[PDB]
Structure formats: structure tokens, C-alpha cells
Amino acid sequence: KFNYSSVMEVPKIDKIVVNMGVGDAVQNSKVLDNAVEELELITGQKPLVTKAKKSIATFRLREGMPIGAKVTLRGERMYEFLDKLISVSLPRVRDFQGVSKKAFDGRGNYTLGVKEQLIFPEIDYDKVSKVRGMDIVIVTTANTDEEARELLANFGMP
Amino acid sequence: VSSTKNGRDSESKRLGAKRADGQFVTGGSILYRQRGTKIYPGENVGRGGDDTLFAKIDGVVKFERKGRDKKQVSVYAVA
Amino acid sequence: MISKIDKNKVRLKRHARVRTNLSGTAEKPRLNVYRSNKHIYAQIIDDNKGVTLAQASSKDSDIATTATKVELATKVGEAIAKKAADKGIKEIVFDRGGYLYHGRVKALAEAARESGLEF
Amino acid sequence: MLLPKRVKYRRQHRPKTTGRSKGGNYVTFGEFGLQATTTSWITSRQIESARIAMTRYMKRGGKVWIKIFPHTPYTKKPLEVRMGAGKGAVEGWIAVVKPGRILFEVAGVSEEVAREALRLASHKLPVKTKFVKREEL
Amino acid sequence: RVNVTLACTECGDRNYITTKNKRNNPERIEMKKYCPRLNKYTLHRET
Amino acid sequence: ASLKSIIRQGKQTRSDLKQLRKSGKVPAVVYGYGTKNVSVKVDEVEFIKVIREVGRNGVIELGVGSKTIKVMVADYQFDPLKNQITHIDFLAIN
RNA sequence: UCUGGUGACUAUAGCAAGGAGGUCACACCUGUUCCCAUGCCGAACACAGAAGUUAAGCUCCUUAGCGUCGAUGGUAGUCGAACUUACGUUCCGCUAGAGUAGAACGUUGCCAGGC
RNA sequence: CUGGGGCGGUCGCCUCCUAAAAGGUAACGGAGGCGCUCAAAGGUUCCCUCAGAAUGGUUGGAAAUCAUUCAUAGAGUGUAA
RNA sequence: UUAUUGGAGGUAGAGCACUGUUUGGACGAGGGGCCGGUUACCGAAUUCAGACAAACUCCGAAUGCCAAUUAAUU
Numbered sequence A: 001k002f003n004y005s006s007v008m009e010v011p012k013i014d015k016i017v018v019n020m021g022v023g024d025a026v027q028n029s030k031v032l033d034n035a036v037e038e039l040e041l042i043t044g045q046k047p048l049v050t051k052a053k054k055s056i057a058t059f060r061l062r063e064g065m066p067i068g069a070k071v072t073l074r075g076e077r078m079y080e081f082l083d084k085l086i087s088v089s090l091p092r093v094r095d096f097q098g099v100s101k102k103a104f105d106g107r108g109n110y111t112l113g114v115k116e117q118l119i120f121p122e123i124d125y126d127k128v129s130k131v132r133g134m135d136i137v138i139v140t141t142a143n144t145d146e147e148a149r150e151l152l153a154n155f156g157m158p
Numbered sequence B: 001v002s003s004t005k006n007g008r009d010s011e012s013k014r015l016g017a018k019r020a021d022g023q024f025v026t027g028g029s030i031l032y033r034q035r036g037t038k039i040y041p042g043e044n045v046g047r048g049g050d051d052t053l054f055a056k057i058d059g060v061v062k063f064e065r066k067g068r069d070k071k072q073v074s075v076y077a078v079a
Numbered sequence C: 001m002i003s004k005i006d007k008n009k010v011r012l013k014r015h016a017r018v019r020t021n022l023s024g025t026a027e028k029p030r031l032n033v034y035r036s037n038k039h040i041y042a043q044i045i046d047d048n049k050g051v052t053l054a055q056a057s058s059k060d061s062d063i064a065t066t067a068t069k070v071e072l073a074t075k076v077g078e079a080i081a082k083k084a085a086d087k088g089i090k091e092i093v094f095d096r097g098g099y100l101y102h103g104r105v106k107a108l109a110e111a112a113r114e115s116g117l118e119f
Numbered sequence D: 001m002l003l004p005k006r007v008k009y010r011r012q013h014r015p016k017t018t019g020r021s022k023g024g025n026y027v028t029f030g031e032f033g034l035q036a037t038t039t040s041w042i043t044s045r046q047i048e049s050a051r052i053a054m055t056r057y058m059k060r061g062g063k064v065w066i067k068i069f070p071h072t073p074y075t076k077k078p079l080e081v082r083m084g085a086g087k088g089a090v091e092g093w094i095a096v097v098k099p100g101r102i103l104f105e106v107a108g109v110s111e112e113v114a115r116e117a118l119r120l121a122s123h124k125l126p127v128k129t130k131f132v133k134r135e136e137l
Numbered sequence E: 001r002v003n004v005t006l007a008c009t010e011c012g013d014r015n016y017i018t019t020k021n022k023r024n025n026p027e028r029i030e031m032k033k034y035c036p037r038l039n040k041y042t043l044h045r046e047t
Numbered sequence F: 001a002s003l004k005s006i007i008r009q010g011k012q013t014r015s016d017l018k019q020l021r022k023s024g025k026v027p028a029v030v031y032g033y034g035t036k037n038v039s040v041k042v043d044e045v046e047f048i049k050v051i052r053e054v055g056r057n058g059v060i061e062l063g064v065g066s067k068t069i070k071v072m073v074a075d076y077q078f079d080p081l082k083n084q085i086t087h088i089d090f091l092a093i094n
Numbered sequence G: 001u002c003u004g005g006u007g008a009c010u011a012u013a014g015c016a017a018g019g020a021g022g023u024c025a026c027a028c029c030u031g032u033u034c035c036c037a038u039g040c041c042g043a044a045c046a047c048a049g050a051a052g053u054u055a056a057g058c059u060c061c062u063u064a065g066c067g068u069c070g071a072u073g074g075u076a077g078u079c080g081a082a083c084u085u086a087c088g089u090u091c092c093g094c095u096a097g098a099g100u101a102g103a104a105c106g107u108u109g110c111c112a113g114g115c
Numbered sequence H: 001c002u003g004g005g006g007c008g009g010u011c012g013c014c015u016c017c018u019a020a021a022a023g024g025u026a027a028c029g030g031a032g033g034c035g036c037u038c039a040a041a042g043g044u045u046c047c048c049u050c051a052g053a054a055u056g057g058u059u060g061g062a063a064a065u066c067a068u069u070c071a072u073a074g075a076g077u078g079u080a081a
Numbered sequence I: 001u002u003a004u005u006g007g008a009g010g011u012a013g014a015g016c017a018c019u020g021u022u023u024g025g026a027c028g029a030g031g032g033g034c035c036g037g038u039u040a041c042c043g044a045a046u047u048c049a050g051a052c053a054a055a056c057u058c059c060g061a062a063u064g065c066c067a068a069u070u071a072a073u074u
């Protein structure tokens, strides 16, 4: 579809980030271990608890106070989690388009949103006490989004 | 009634260079006195705790540039 | 997209931070190490004149086999000390390049200690 | 009524007065202008009086620019005080001109209206002035 | 933030003087330092 | 486009520059393609009349000594008070 | 001369763009069995490899587009001298910053290999 | 001490400006700080490199966090400059 | 004391590359006229041109300062 001059020159995915979000812990410290348990249930890696970088006002924040979580999937764990998210997400979402018409930042990023609906696709709503959301970005070797549109069409719902 | 609130000053510290370029020095003499590092040390020159530059051996002293905008001091041997 | 940086230009930033307290002075010369992917190199340098003195290699025909990539590195360390034994078999300074003192760099240094050098 | 909104230091040394104009001595924005011939301070009340007398003669026709802004504060000690108990409070804001500096520029009007409008302004400044064109050649 | 004295077990006298504050380290701290009476290192404990 | 020039000698002092400007002359230099740095003299009144008939940006065939050079005008320093030109730089083009 | 390793030099050495180059060197690349490793990830680091590729790094050409360098001439300032009290003038030395012409797509020491 | 004296204010130490391209240099001249802290915020050996801006993205107080391109330190450096 | 060499340092002057100040003109994003939007207005950002500084400097003198020469005069 692009007529590549050499087979080494072809676009491919590189890394997927499973960064969750804030989870502002003024009193959600027990939920934070459960939010870590939610990511440890969603993905097969203990996520890096990303702490804050400032102490800004009008917010429950200071130097420290770990306010995030992220796990990086690169190899076969990225290859296995991408196949199950191709099937057990869109049937669990039931949307029209599914992600967006254009969500890249000029580089080829997916940046799909989540609102705790396809989350816990293994266990039912038994222990969950609050809603949440994940952010699944797709880092790839595409130069621009138009070349990435040929990559996003393969097993995608643009 | 009027008054002011500015009368304070510190005692001045006698900074700057102490030996000249081309001059023979003895092996422990202070070359330059500074806050921070306006001039780096070069050959046979030590750098003190309060950033004072001093000579290791006795010889003649040369000031010389280091990069684009950096300066250093060296002491060379034969007199 | 995603940009991979080459490993060699990151090494030289690490190498220049190392070689700032370290030099060869012709009483105590410097040997540095360069490994590419398939060979191991070694070279004695006096930094005061900028003149090198000795050299050994993995791709040299005198030492050329397919042992381990590590037993290869040992034979280089035995090789460089013999030419260092001709003159200046005194203490030297080991320049680790920009590498971790581990594995193939480490096996080169152990072979140089066990064959006459005094570092 | 021109004055800066905030200044880092309220009490400053007075500016150096001898010399010539550092720059800003060619008309660029308009067609005609008024340049200075001697040296003085201009204290931000003069350029309010001069700008008003400029404006009402042109009947709100073309545009008018001011090339001078009063940046420097000056102080004054109150009435009947002995010397030296600190430096007094501010009084006003001055700008320093030297021979060469353009003071006002007008445009969008005929030449003989511009001469008369600038003549009325010139009787309100403390400096000798002169009418100039837009230089070329 | 107080003055504090380290003393040897058998070095004879009380030489080294350091500082600490009581709120961060209320315990009796101890180090290995040099007393030249024995020409070695010995445990020195806060009195 | 037929202006005339006179080559200055070495090391003009301060006095003989302002004595040269109290006449109708203005100091100048020529440089550029195929030439070297030569410092010259030009009448002010003649220079204005040539500019006002060929424009600001035109070609002037001025003569230095014997030969004549096709020359454009690069820059000029102007005295805004007392309105006289005080320096002119000439650029050869071919 | 070509390639590589390693030093010296204020980017004239940089940045960007365009075009060619390879199993000799270099690198992507293959793999995680072993030393070793990731606040998670054999990505990185380390090790074991040599199927694949010049696409990228890299190297060689092309360009003055950005950055850098930059005279001559004039001017501002000023040491000394001479008149004067003018927001000064005159003489003689020194001589900027800005701007213009122009330079420039590196120069070079040591060793090994390939010539 | 004091532009008479009194009333007022100040008296030791650190850093800038005045200070006239070495150093030094006054005024009741202009601006600010100190009368500590740290058992690691010390020593050594190995790794790493920012704020900010732009662009995408559930919570989005606009900016918290995540990815991406630039970004001469503009970040940070116990405490004033 | 002078001649010749070498060096330290940031004044005068200039300049806007940082920090602050400021005048016009454009550009578009936002609120914003409206009937959510136009248009007007607002503030912020980015650019073109042009100005200011003792506690601003990408630059940077003259003079003075420190020294060394079997130099020359004292």
C-alpha cells in the first residue's frame, strides 16, 4: 500500500502505555492499593506508581503523594494484550465509531479513553466501589497520521 | 518626623588576582581569590575549599583561555 | 513516532566524563578499550604526547578463533602485555572506555593483570 | 497622565543630560514631525498639554504618534525641611530629550495644517523645536 | 539541637564532640572513631 | 551618471576631515567586485543631482583616477540636524 | 589516498535540506540457555548469536537556508594639550558597538588495517 | 551619633548598587537578610538529566497525571542577594 | 620614567540576546455582538517596525593596574 524500497523500512508498533490517571488520594489510600490491584488485574505487570511532580495549590497535592500508575507493555505481553482488547472491548462498549476520527498528535498516537466499562473484563462488579478510567496510547514507527491511518485500519474501528 | 531604614553594609573582601602573568612564584602562593569559579584551575594549580586558586609547584604563571568563554591558570616548571 | 538513539554517541558522553581525572603520563600510561559487536580492541596511549605505543585486536590474524567472544577477550589481554613487557611493563592506568566494568571488559582486564602488568 | 504601571525601583538617580540623541531621530510612522534642538526634561504634564492642542486643531483628522514616554521618577522633599534625613517621596515622571530626538509625528493631513498644528504644540514644551519632513534620497 | 559528647570504652578521656537534635534522634548514637591511646578504632558512645 | 572623484591620501586626521566637509566635499570609499579598497572624495552638490536623476538605486559610472567603474550605492551616514550627508559607501557590481 | 581507533584546536568545525554508498570495517538485526538487568518492561543494560537489510545511524558528494566568523571606511566615546563656563569649542594620539563587502558545508597529530 | 540640641531612629555580622573596567573608598544615601539547620541535606562508587511551551488524551479546577517535538538551564541548587 | 611584550578586569559608549518598562501595526486561538456563530469589545499568545535602565548586558574602549627585558635615561 506504500511500495517500500526495503523490507526493513516498514511501520510497526513500539510500545503501549497503560497509564490510569489521577485517583486523587485525600482519603483513597485503601482504594489506591485497589486501583493498583485493578491495573494488576487488567495487565500482567505491577504498574509504576507515578507520583506527583509539584505541590500546586487548590488541590490535594504536595511533593510526593503518589497520584498515578502506569505499566509499559512492549513484547509478547503487548502482543497478547492487544489481541484480547481487539475483541473484548468493542463488544463490551457498543459505540458507533469506537474511538475517534482523528486522535493522533501528528505522530500516530491512539490515545483512547476509558470510563470503567470495558475495565474488569475478567471479574464482574463484585469489589469495585468507584468508577475509574484508563489511557491506552499506541507508540508506533509511523511518521505521520496519514501513514498511521493505514496502520490504524488493520484491526481497527476508525 | 522622618527616618530611614537603610544603613547596613558588609565589610569588603579583597578579591581578585594576586600574581601577574609571567611572574615567578613559590610553590604555595595564592594566585586568584574568588566566589565561585570565574577561572578554572589548569596545570599544577590547586583549587581550594573557598574556591581559591593556588600553585602546586614553583614556576611561572600563565593565564589562558579554556573553551569559547572559559579561563584557566597554569604554572609551568622551568625558571 | 519513536526515536532510538545510537549507543556509541551516548558512550562518548560517558567516556569524556570518565577521562577527566585519568591520563597517560609516560611513566604511567593509559590503556583504553573499544568493543564494537564482534571484536575487542586495546591500545596503550601516552596522553602527554598523544603517541600510542601498543595494540592488540580480536580481528588480528595471530589471535583469530570462534571461542566465546569472552575467551577471545582473554587472549587479547595476554597479547597486549607481551608487547607491554618489551618496555613500560610498569604500572599503567586502566581506561574502561565508557562501559561497565563487567563481562567482556572485565575479562580483558583480568588477563592483563595475570600476565605481568601492575594495575 | 502617562506613567508606567509598575517600576522595580521607585527612587532613582537622575539621568545624564549632556550629549546627543542616542537614537529614535528619524520619522518612521507618519509624514511630518517635530524635532528638538536643545536639551531638557519633559514632565508628562507638558506632553498632555501639547497633545491636546495638537488634536483639536486637526479636527480629529489624521493620526498622531508620541515618540516619548516618561519612564523615570523624580522625587521632592516636602515644604521647609532641613537637609538630609533620607530621600523624599516621588513627585512626577520625566523623560529626557537631547538635540535630534523626534517628539511627535502626524500624518493624514495636508502640509500647511501640519505646520500650524505642530507650531501650537511647540509653545508648550520647554525645548526649542523645528519642523521636519520624511527624509529620502 | 544540643551539644553532645562521644566517649570511648577504654580510651581514658572524652575527646570527640558532635551535635544532634533530640526530636530526630532521641537515642544514644554510637560510631567507630579513632582514639590514639590504642592506635586503632574503637566504639564511641554518647554519654 | 558621470560623477567625478579624487583619491584621498593616507591618514586623514580629525581636522582635515572637518575642513573637507566645510567645503562641498564628502568622504567615501569604493569596494566590491574586481576592485580594492580606495578612499575617495565627492562633491556634495554634484552627488545630489546625480541621485535625483537616476534614483535611489541606480548605476553610476564614476571615475577613480583614470578608469571608470559601474557603481551602485550601498549605504550613507546622514546628519539629521543641519541636514547634510557626511559619508557615502560605494559598491561595484559588474 | 581509503576505513577505523584515539588526541589537539574560540561552530570557519554547528544545524537544516538534497543525492549516492556496504557481509571488509560499523550498525540495525536473531535470541534470553548462562554472568547480569529493569520503582513495570531482555526497551534500556548484560550475554549468546549471525538468518536478514543499506531503510536508519554512519560515511562521501551538493547548497550559503538558519547559526557562527568578519575587514576597509566613517561615526560615538576618550588620554594629553590649548581656549573658555558654554547641556561647550579647537588641535593631536588611540579607536568602538551597530551596519556593509566578504569567509565558511572543518583543519591536523599517532597507530592498525585496507590500498 | 545627630546639617544646633531635644523628640524620633540607629549602634555587631552577610550580600548587591552608589564605587569613576585592579583592590580600596563617605553620607540620618538606595534595597534586603542573620543570631540557624542536616545523622543525612555528610564521604565514596555507579547510573540519570530539567523547567517551560506546543500537540493528543476519562477525571481535566486552564494547568495535577500520561505520551510526543523543541526547550542553555530560563529548572533545581536547606535558608537573603 | 619611557619604549616594547604579556595579562587581570566589564566603566564610558552602544545594544535588546535575558530581566523589567513602553509605543504603533498585523496575525490568528479564546471569551465575546448576536439569531451556538457573524460584527464590536476584551485580555492572552506569536510576529513587523521603533524606544528606556544605577541595582539589564549578546558586546565593549580610552586611561589606569600587575609584571619581565645583558633595553635606554635618571
Ligand SMILES: [Mg+2]
Pocket: D023, D024
Ligand atoms: Mg534604533
Ligand SMILES: [Mg+2]
Pocket: none
Ligand atoms: Mg531486542
Ligand SMILES: [Mg+2]
Pocket: none
Ligand atoms: Mg566593528
Ligand SMILES: [Mg+2]
Pocket: none
Ligand atoms: Mg578604577
Ligand SMILES: [Mg+2]
Pocket: none
Ligand atoms: Mg573596583
Ligand SMILES: [Mg+2]
Pocket: none
Ligand atoms: Mg535588619
Ligand SMILES: [Mg+2]
Pocket: none
Ligand atoms: Mg550608558
Ligand SMILES: [Mg+2]
Pocket: D013, I054
Ligand atoms: Mg550613576
Ligand SMILES: [Mg+2]
Pocket: none
Ligand atoms: Mg550598565
